[PDB]
């Protein structure tokens, strides 16, 4: 199991450098529209921002939009939620077949980490139950696009990096301006719900282990869906969603999901030094789709 990202090429060609005054972050260029975090017009960094005041005192000639150093012409600016939609003269001839999607907790997507309008890194990530992600961003990362590429080649744009909470957790907004989990794009004290282990992923992970000859961890015990769900209550795990999806892989193991449910309890206690696919603790980083795709090319 390797955490990987989908190719970033088609998304790179939509990333632009958006500058207001001296403030520089990233934008996504689709059609004749550039979407970027609205805090690009914020006068200060260590203080509550009056976005309404910032926007009415906004002036267009202070914007500088570039793609690989080639400057586009700003025509209009509109504020919607936590983003700005910057209308430009030139249309992006490399606009991929795309839609806008809002992610749900448990969904995997890809982050294209960008600085100064130039992509510097790409990686796979999961939207957690508290609507945050665990990425890596520093000064100037905001506007970095999150995406998924469907099988037919449609690009789903679903994330624009905006904020890092005090806990270290990272948060973005969708392309409609809605900040995930209803956090504010303000430097206020904001605390998120405690993270839960994506039990769907853990089950998928354990099936992967079975498929690789790793079997030592298999418990002789059985545990039903409800019995596990309130074991989950006291140990920081999600509910198991919800048995009928694992019928295909249950066979190649002779192991029921219930037998995959009781082991998590026993292994939660500890591994006793031993490992599972290199991991010394339970892993919820991989979805079932990721597993099957890496195993069999589906």
């Amino acid at each position: 199991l390797k955490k990987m990202a989908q190719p970033s090429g088609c998304v790179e060609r939509c990333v632009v450098r958006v500058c207001y005054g001296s403030t520089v972050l990233n934008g996504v260029w689709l059609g004749d529209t550039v979407t970027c975090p609205r805090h690009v017009i914020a006068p200060s960094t260590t203080v509550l921002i009056d976005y309404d005041h910032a926007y009415s005192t906004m002036r267009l000639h202070n914007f500088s939009v570039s793609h690989n150093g080639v400057f586009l012409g700003v025509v209009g600016v509109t504020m919607h939620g936590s983003v700005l939609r910057i209308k430009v003269s030139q249309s992006n001839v490399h606009t991929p077949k795309h839609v806008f999607k809002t992610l749900k907790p448990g969904d995997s997507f890809n982050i294209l980490a960008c600085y100064e309008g130039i992509a510097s890194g790409v990686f796979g990530v999961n939207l957690r139950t508290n609507f945050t992600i665990k990425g890596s961003f520093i000064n100037g990362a905001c506007g970095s696009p999150g995406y998924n590429v469907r099988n037919d080649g449609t690009v789903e744009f679903c994330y624009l990096h905006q904020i890092e909470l005090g806990s270290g957790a990272h948060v973005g907004s969708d392309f409609t301006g809605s900040v995930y989990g209803n956090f504010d794009d303000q430097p206020s004290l904001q605390v998120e719900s405690a993270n839960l282990m994506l039990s769907d992923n853990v089950v998928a992970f354990l099936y992967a282990a079975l498929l690789n000859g790793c079997r030592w961890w298999l418990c002789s015990t059985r545990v039903n869906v409800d019995g596990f769900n309130e074991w989950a209550m006291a140990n920081g795990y999600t509910s198991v969603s919800s048995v009928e999806c694992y019928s295909i892989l249950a066979a190649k193991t002779g192991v029921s999901v219930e037998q995959l449910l009781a082991s998590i309890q026993h292994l939660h206690e500890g591994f006793g030094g031993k490992n599972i696919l290199g991991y010394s603790s339970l892993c919820d980083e991989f979805t079932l789709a990721e597993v099957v795709k890496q195993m069999y090319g589906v």
């Binding site: 520093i138 890092e164 005090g166 956090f183 794009d185 430097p187 904001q190």
Partner: peptide
């Protein structure tokens, strides 16, 4: 506490 990147 939160920091806008």
């Amino acid at each position: 506490x939160a920091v806008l990147x």
